[PDB]
Every structure is written in C-alpha cells, then in structure tokens.
Amino acid sequence: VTQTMKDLDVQKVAGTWYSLAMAASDISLLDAQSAPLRVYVEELKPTPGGDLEILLQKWENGKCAQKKIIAEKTEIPAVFKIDALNENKVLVLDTDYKKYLLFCMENSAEPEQSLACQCLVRTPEVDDEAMEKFDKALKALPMHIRLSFNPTQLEEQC
Amino acid sequence: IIVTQTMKDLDVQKVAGTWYSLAMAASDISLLDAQSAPLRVYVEELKPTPGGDLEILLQKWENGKCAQKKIIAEKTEIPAVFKIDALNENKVLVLDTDYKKYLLFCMENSAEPEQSLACQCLVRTPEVDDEAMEKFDKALKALPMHIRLSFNPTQLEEQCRV
C-alpha cells in the first residue's frame, strides 16, 4: 500500500529539480514525447502562504515550452489542488528535501485513468536510492508504463 | 553491463502454440515509445520446427492496421539463443519459461546490445499472470531498461492495438 507522506515542509522542496523517472497507469498518457502527462519538472517555487508553483516543460507545438501550474495547499498535509493537465491533484509521496521527491498527479474523479507519478531529483544524475523508493511506491500502484532518463537526457531535459 | 541468464536445456517444441505479449521493456525509450516504434511488437504464436528453429508470428501496428510478421529464428549452439535477421535485430534469447503459462525473452542486436535490447514477458492466456510479471521484473532488475509497458486483458485480446 503506497501513500501520501505525513508532514510536508513545502518551503524545503524549493529550487531546481529534474524528472529522473515517470510512470502512468495509462500508457497513452505517457507514451510519446507529446503525450499529455509527459511533463518534466524544472523547478518548484513556494508561495508565502505555503502553496507550490510548479515549473515544467512539455512538448506543446513541436517545441519545448515552459508551463506553470499552481498547486493550492489543503487541510491534508501533502495533497494539493491543481487545475491543469486534466489532473485535479498532486500527492507528494515521499521526500528528504535534499536529494529526491516522489509525487503523483491525478484526477480524483478517475484516479486510475489519470494517475501519473514522477521521481524528481536535485541534480542531473541517476540516484539509485531515489529509484528504489520510486520502484517501491510503484509496486503498489496500478502502473502500465515507466520511463527513466540518462544524465545526458536530464541536463537537456525535454 | 548486461548479463542475462539463459534457459538451461530449453525444449523448444514445448513453447508451441498461442501466446500474448503481457509486458515489454527496452533499454531505449524510442524503441517502444509509440505504437509506431520499431520494437513495439505483440506476439501471436510460436511455431517450432523439427530442426529446432522457431518461427515467431507477431503483429505490428503500421497504417490503420495490425500487420502480421513472420520471424524465423534459427538455432545456434545454445538452445535458448536464436539468430534472427528482423526488426534490425539479430538475436533472440529465451531467459526462462515453464512452457504451460509464461515465457520471457529478449531480442537484441549483438553489434549494439545495450541500445538494441528489448525484452518481453509472454503468457498463454490473455490474463495478467502475477507470478509471470514478478519473474519478468527480476529478469529486468539488472537490465538497462528505460521503458516498460504492460497490457490489461482487453488489450491482450485485441492483438497489437492499445
């Protein structure tokens, strides 16, 4: 049983991240460089009230582009409301703040059609410890596609 | 590296019949990224020959259609290693099987074995064999895979199309 973490300190997630890996419950959501949930987190920027701004890249029109998503904090610690990528929620599964963050995105109305989860890392390198906590969370989740990226692919994200 | 257990003393006549690709992985995302990707292939059947070869019938989404391919895989000195010349690959390796339920295999080009490697978990019925995926995952735990896919029973039944 995989789960959303107890206390999240949204201010220490702040800064530069790289999407090392990604899984989704539906192949097509993550299948293609222009698949809807094939987004690469560049940066996380807290607001003073404790919301999270997500900076990411996505193939839009043949080109890499920046997209900005606001994740609004809720009464449940590590659970944010968003209204983007057809998802309505972000769930931070685990983080140590300094090396890795594991999150999921979904649409509450169709949790299985919608679930995608990423393994963010702080530096552009394969961190095997982050991948094992990602694999562990994945084992309990109904995932039908996974992707991992090189250090080459992570400096030149998207 | 890539190091990959073969099936010891494989009996290829026992793999005969109908199979479905339940899962695939490749080392290169572009190999399996998309229906149109070069190693996105869904097995239909394994037809052994008496000499010990192994004809593989599979399907490949190409235009609107699933398109049937016939890959003859010839025996080599090793029973679980075959030589092919198809999908720009030259080697089929059977890693493991129990003949009645699951078969794990891998294809590769021996000129670029890292960048060419795709494996699949095959099952006999169009259902999620849970013991079969676990063995696939343990086979994969030491392969350089960057793309994994698995299919639900309805996708299994609908040969090739997702």
Q: How many residues does chain A have?
A: 158
Closest chain B C-alpha to A145 CA, distance in angstroms: 4
Q: Are B49 and B55 in contact (CB under 8 A)?
A: yes
Is A140 at the interface with chain B, CB within 8 A?
no
Contacts of B36 (CB under 8 A, 6+ apart): B61, B62
User: Residue B52 in 3-state DSSP?
Assistant: coil
Cα separation, B153 vs B155, in Å, equals: 5
Q: Nearest-CA neighbor of A22 among A4, A10, A38, A3?
A: A38
CB atoms within 10 A of CB B70: 12
Q: Which of A28, A31, A147 sits opposite B146 (nearest CB)?
A: A147
Question: Is the Cβ of B69 closer than 8 Å to some Cβ of chain A?
Answer: no
B120 φ/ψ angles, rounded to the nearest 5 degrees: -140, 150
Distance between CA atoms of A60 and B117, rounded to whole angstroms?
30
Q: What residue numbers bound the domain in which A19 lies?
A: 1-158
CB contact set of B77 (below 8 Å; sequence gap of 6+): none
Q: How far apart are CA A149 and CA A124, in angstroms?
A: 10
Q: How many domains does chain A have?
A: 1
| Structural element, H or E, at residue A65 | strand A64-71
Burial label, B51 (beta-carbon count in 10 A; 0-12, 13-18, 19+): exposed
Q: How far apart are CA B151 and CA B21, in angstroms?
A: 8
Which of A126, A148, A149, A152 has the highest number of chain B CBs within 10 A, making it the mutation to test binding with B?
A148
Q: What is the DSSP string of A70-138?
A: EEB--SSTTEEEEEETTEEEEEEEEE-SSSEEEEEEE-TTSHHHH-EEEEEESSSS--HHHHHHHHHHH
| Residue at token pair 């702080």 | A122
* B95 contacts B7 by C-beta, under 8 angstroms: yes
Tokens representing A58 are 């996505």
Contact yes or no for A112/A25 (Cβ under 8 A) = yes
Nearest to B148 among A32, A33, A145 (CB): A145
- Facing residues of A92 across strands? A103
B152: nearest Cα among B131, B123, B115: B123
Which residues on neighbouring strands pair with residue A104, listed in sequence order? A91, A117
**8 A C-beta contact, residue A118 and residue A125:** no
Angle (CA) A108 A113 A114, round 5°: 55
> Among candidates B96, B101, B98, which has minimal Cα distance to B130?
B101
Cross-strand partners of B60 = B67
Q: Does A107 touch chain B (CB under 8 A)?
A: no
Residue A105 main-chain phi, psi, to 5 deg = -130, 150
Strand order in the sheet with A40-46: A15-16, A40-46, A52-59, A64-71
3-state secondary structure at position B119:
strand
- What is the resolution in angstroms? 2.1
Instruction: Name every chain A residue with its beta carbon within 8 A of the beta carbon of B162.
Output: 27-28
Residue B138 main-chain phi, psi, to 5 deg = -80, -35
SS3 assignment, position B156: helix
What CATH number is associated with residue B96? 2.40.128.20
Contacts of A57 (CB under 8 A, 6+ apart): A39, A40, A42, A64, A65, A66, A67, A157, A158
* Solving technique: X-ray
